[PDB]
């Protein structure tokens, strides 16, 4: 891992530039035929630093006081995370690397205020990205530690990003959680339920308990 830091006491220009510096370090491996992963721990703090510089240069303000090019700020950064063909890698390496496709995968992080996904910066980044993993405070306080709301989270790439074994066993997991979201009020009346529905309800509750995992315990 490469760790790039621009802490809270450092100049807003350094906080604004850090994601581009880290992206440039990640692009080395992609352009040379290899694969890299980049995490931007707070794109919302980069937007706040760029807003400070803009209002101090007296640039015309918009919604939430952000400058007119705040969408272009994150879009110019996030469109670099990509997969490039073998012909791009052979052109860049001037023939040295051949037959290999390079890539840069990005995991940007954004903080919402009281679940408001309609705020200006969150709306921009939700529209730029290929998918979203939504974490919820109500699920996290209910013991569901990973807190992933699977009902609204989505990956537009989908099954193309899965190995054959996980792609075959994930289909039913989707159906069981969907059935559990539909039949969650009936838990207090499990006795009065119809047998078929009661069978589905316990399956939904057992698959829901399976998703719970511990920190620093990645599974193969």
């Amino acid at each position: 891992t490469i760790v790039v830091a621009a802490s809270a006491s450092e100049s807003a220009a350094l906080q604004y530039l850090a994601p581009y510096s880290g992206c440039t370090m990640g692009e080395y491996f992609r352009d040379r035929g290899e694969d890299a992963l980049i995490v931007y721990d707070d794109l919302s703090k980069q937007a706040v630093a760029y807003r400070q510089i803009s209002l101090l240069l007296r640039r015309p303000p918009g919604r939430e006081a952000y400058p007119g090019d705040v969408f272009y700020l994150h879009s110019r950064l996030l469109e670099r995370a990509s997969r490039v063909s073998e012909e791009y890698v052979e052109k860049f390496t001037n023939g040295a690397v051949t037959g290999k496709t390079g890539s840069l995968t990005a995991l940007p992080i954004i903080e919402t205020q009281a679940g408001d996904v309609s705020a200006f910066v969150p709306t921009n980044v939700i529209s730029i990205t290929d998918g979203q993993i939504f974490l919820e405070s109500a699920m996290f306080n209910s013991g569901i530690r990973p807190a992933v709301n699977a009902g609204i989270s989505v990956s537009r790439v989908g099954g193309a990003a899965q190995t054959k074994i996980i792609k075959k066993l994930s289909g039913g997991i989707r159906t069981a959680l969907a059935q559990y979201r539909e039949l969650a009020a009936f838990a207090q009346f499990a006795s009065d339920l119809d047998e078929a529905t009661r069978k589905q309800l316990e399956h939904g509750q057992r698959v829901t308990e399976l998703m719970k995992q511990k920190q620093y315990a990645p599974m193969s």
């Binding site: 015309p60 303000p61 918009g62 919604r63 400058p67 007119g68 090019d69």
Partner: peptide, 19 residues
């Protein structure tokens, strides 16, 4: 519509309802 909002802000025009 959003690209028009961005250009209007860059040119310094006064924003309307809902920004």
């Amino acid at each position: 519509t959003l690209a028009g909002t961005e250009v209007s802000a860059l040119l310094g025009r006064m924003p309307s309802a809902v920004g």
